[PDB]
Design a protein around this ligand. Structure first.
Ligand code: SF4
Ligand code: SF4
Ligand SMILES: [Fe+3]
Ligand code: NA
Ligand code: NA
Lengths: 605, 605
């Protein structure tokens, strides 16, 4: 078996016992790895109805077959668990170097169970797996945590994945950070880790991931790297301005959400664009393991010093979303989210809900006391609240619950722009209707990257589609993106490789490395199998398609007020049933046993 | 002699010559000390015509007789030199602990002449005076500079006075900082220091300042202290909220300048008040040497960490003055001014000039590039430009010349709210006319604390006067304040003792410590002598009364737009000639030979 090691660590924190389990190539041929392997283990061992914050829930950190190889961007891994925020499955992808290091230690994944009695951290150095006391690290920011551990194990090569005070305090949108600023960010994966009293995981490896045909593999690798290098996005836009290049693009297209999705055009968007960032604060770009793109940003601020990020989504969530223009305040806010272990999107989305509730008079000043008023454009909200949230201090305790619960507690859940309680990202669905269907059907909630329909609808990859086309062809593109993305996630590659590479390219790399002879059609079915397995878990976890697969009324009832998309609304009712049909599911959005048997997963009926 | 040692160091940085000089009690009985002693030395030894940044200018750091004693607040010192910004005399006062340490070392002052060939710093340890190389500290911020020097001299007890990058780069409003956040802030004193390649002065002393009658002094001090403690300002307001308590007060009186003095009422003033700061960021209060008041602020922000300040004037200059409400951004900005060695007031005033030039289309975006636009309320201006001013980078190079020179270069000096090129402070004169005369006549330029008419006109100290009373009585209060403040400055005390103490109490404190039998009138005349001396120095430097003793047209011709002072203008024209008459000066603001003779300073005629 190549690429994959066929080994994974299983740690039971309650009992303290560790065991290295193995699996066979036939399992890999079914679920590929990372995201796919994770959903299988969950489906086979965990009751989908467990309380996400109880010791029965499992946290799976998993690398993919191409993670740690020379495959361009082969350094990604996924964290999978039941979300304490949405109540459904969640896969959070992260880059950096941690993923590659796990593979170098000789493991594919780590299955964490139970709950330790006192804070601890797992130290791994090749075959040496150890559970150490973290009572002295608990309470520290990510940067401090990494520093302490590196000094303790006396090694700077050790890669670390940790939670900040937010995770420790069970903030519903706590993230798991690694390599300082890389995030397995959404779904509350950090709260799950914190509930187990697991402060961090430190790895050191020295092995070389086995590849089926090195000569052939290196041949393929150079061809793909060349394609990415010749692409204007992967070869010009991203390395030069990072993901933040999108600001001006999405704004010019009139779907850049401003003030909790009230409108889609922001007059000061340029001030927080990738181009403006590059001219004002950028030091250089930074690549994740084995990346020929280098979209990561390294900024320097006279206040917080050198820092990494923010990504587009973070610039938006903490900027225009809140009616804030100040890029410097946005960079500071991003840095604090990284240090504290908070998802930038949910944080900003939660702060936007409070601002709208405040605007509508549901949150009164007498309730805030002397804390900054939740007034649009108020930058003090960013400097003050982010820390209060991490520690559940003051109003920070209410905010730590997330947008939905916060709005619901004031009797106005309609002001919460969430889908399955996950806060929506930087693109208004009224200007890209296929992307809207994505938000409604995404297995993890109102999320954009597990089905990035902005590529076809706005960017022109694979090719340009009308953002207002709601035909079967548009629905089919969605299904394709969902399955393909499931493949890419499982492979261990970065989604951005789609700016140059296509399904066949991924087949070439996977075959050369694994030594398989699958057609592109075979790999895509693994993706469809993964998408369906996640849906089933959710369905078993209690998902009601009618109530849960929707979009906030704002998008279905209020015409876009201005910009090139003025007058538009998302035609979800029309698309939804056709989507279920084309997915092979029933009218009511459920998976019939016939489909399960077809995908070879009827054992989970 | 008592209080004063009667000794001072004279250092010629060009040759490295060091001299400890002495003076008799007769000189001390005429000039008292600190500010007074410094002006005598300059009138006596320096050509008032020298270029402020040439090595011929002299920098005088001088403590006063009560500095380093147990007198309430006895830890103040002054920096006096010819200003690069205004072209006139400047006396900058500072607290903290540096002043006392210099007295413990056994010296009253340090006179720096010439210019070092390369960066050096002066080290003093009692009798040990040494000029050391600072080529490696040069370029570092105040905190780093101090940490480095303490590691080098191997003593954590050394107190340091230094300049930051702003001083090194000759920014016209660069300040001299001591004890990290204490400032000898206005007039460009830091630029003079930097023009001499002098990075810092580190002192360490172990002596005790000699008091005339120790037991008598102890009892006098007890009485004075008890007066301060029972006063509502000195005993409640200051320690609790710092100088920032003034925000709400000045704002409700309608003379809190907003947007470069366009109006006097700011709607979000509360968010940046001492009360809000106490509730949001305040950790604790901190007193200077021998101070029973403790008005110093110690704050903590998630971004920059723990810091000290801001004072009222700083909160204003970087807040309402620029149309900014964010107290967090303001504290950050204050922090960077302290670190970089920039006067907060001239920094805020210069930025405000820029914002009005920008608003009126004189500064165009084409000129800024990707740098933050000077739009009112843009917090990015605080985050981005401050460091640029200090490093003289990009537009920062133009901003480094100050408000007047900047406005002048665009052909619009009238947009510059300056008097003798010194940026105006946090009080609109249209709401305090006597204070206006203060701005017009203050020897160092448009400044408020060398003649704080806000005490009688708004606060009721010595007693409440009407802010629109422009009679001779109002004019007499100003002169009294000008002379008394010259006394207090010379004594080595803090001006805040005036919230409880009066002229007689200073006479008591001064007589018990020095061994004199002076009357209150004798002391007040020393203050008058110092005031005329400074005026005389300015006349010799080129002061033109008719032209220099005024206020910007805005205050003379534009009525306060709104608030409690609506419709008011400063009736300067009719107060000015009466002030000269009361001063014993000529109709054209010159000092006749007879007055100089009356004061005993005719030798300088
Ligand atoms: S394209 Fe960006 S996010 Fe992806 S692997 Fe490269 S540096 Fe990382
Ligand atoms: S009143 Fe304030 S500035 Fe004055 S000596 Fe005391 S702490 Fe220092
Ligand atoms: Fe900030
Ligand atoms: Na990041
Ligand atoms: Na200060």
């Amino acid at each position: 078996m190549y690429g994959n090691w066929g080994r994974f660590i299983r740690v039971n924190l309650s009992t303290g016992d560790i065991k290295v389990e193995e699996y066979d190539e036939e399992l890999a041929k079914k679920w590929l790895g990372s995201r796919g392997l994770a959903i299988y283990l969950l489906l086979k061992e965990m009751d989908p109805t467990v309380d996400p914050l109880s010791p029965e829930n499992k946290l799976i950190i998993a690398a993919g077959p191409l993670t740690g190889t020379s495959a361009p961007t082969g350094g990604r891994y996924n964290v999978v668990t039941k979300s304490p925020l949405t109540g459904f499955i969640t896969m959070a992808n992260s880059g950096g170097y941690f993923g590659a290091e796990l593979k170098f230690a000789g493991y594919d994944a780590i299955v964490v169970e139970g709950k330790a009695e006192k804070p601890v951290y797992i130290y791994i150095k090749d075959e040496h797996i150890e559970i150490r006391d973290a009572s002295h690290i608990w309470g520290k920011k990510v940067s401090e945590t990494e520093a302490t551990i590196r000094k303790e194990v006396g090694s700077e090569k050790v890669k670390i994945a940790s939670i900040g005070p937010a995770g420790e305090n069970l903030v519903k949108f706590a993230a798991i950070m690694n390599d300082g600023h890389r995030a397995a960010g959404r779904g509350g994966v950090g709260a799950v880790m914190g509930s187990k009293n697991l402060k961090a995981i430190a790895v050191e490896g020295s092995k070389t991931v086995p590849i089926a045909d090195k000569q052939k593999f290196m041949l393929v690798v150079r061809e793909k790297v060349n394609k990415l290098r010749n692409d204007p996005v992967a070869g010009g836009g991203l390395p030069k301005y990072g993901t933040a290049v999108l600001v001006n693009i999405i704004n010019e297209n009139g779907l850049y959400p401003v003030k909790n999705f009230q409108t889609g055009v922001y007059p000061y968007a340029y001030e927080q664009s990738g181009e403006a960032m590059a001219a004002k604060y950028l030091v250089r770009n930074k690549p994740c393991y084995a990346c020929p793109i280098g979209c990561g940003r390294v900024n320097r601020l006279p206040t917080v010093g050198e820092t990494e990020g923010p990504e587009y989504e973070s610039v938006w969530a903490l900027g225009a979303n809140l009616g804030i223009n100040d890029l410097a305040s946005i960079i500071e806010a991003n840095h604090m989210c990284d240090e504290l272990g908070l998802d930038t999107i949910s944080t900003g989305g939660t702060l936007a809900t409070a601002m709208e509730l405040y605007e509508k008079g549901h949150i009164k000043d007498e309730e805030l006391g002397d804390a900054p008023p939740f007034r649009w454009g108020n930058t003090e909200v960013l400097h003050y609240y982010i820390e209060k949230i991490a520690k559940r201090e003051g109003f920070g305790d209410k905010l730590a619950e997330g947008s939905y619960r916060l709005a619901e507690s004031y009797g106005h859940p309609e002001l919460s722009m969430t889908v399955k309680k996950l806060e929506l990202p930087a693109y208004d669905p009224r200007g890209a209707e296929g992307h809207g269907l994505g938000y409604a059907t995404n297995n993890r909630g109102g999320c954009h990257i597990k089905n990035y329909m902005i590529s076809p609808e706005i960017l022109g990859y694979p090719y340009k589609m009308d953002p207002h086309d709601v035909s079967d062809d548009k629905i089919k593109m969605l299904i394709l993106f969902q399955d393909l993305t499931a493949l890419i996630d499982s492979a261990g590659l970065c989604l951005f490789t789609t700016f140059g590479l296509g399904a066949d390219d991924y087949r070439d790399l996977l075959n050369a490395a694994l030594g398989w002879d699958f057609t592109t059609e075979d790999y895509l079915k693994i993706g469809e199998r993964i998408w369906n397995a996640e849906r089933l878990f959710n369905l078993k976890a209690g998902l009601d398609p009618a109530r849960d697969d929707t979009l906030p009324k704002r998008f279905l009832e209020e015409p876009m007020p201005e910009g090139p998309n003025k007058g538009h609304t998302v035609r979800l009712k029309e698309m939804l049933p056709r989507y279920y049909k084309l997915r092979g599911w029933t009218e009511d959005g459920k998976i019939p046993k016939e489909k399960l048997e077809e995908l070879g997963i009827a054992e989970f009926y």
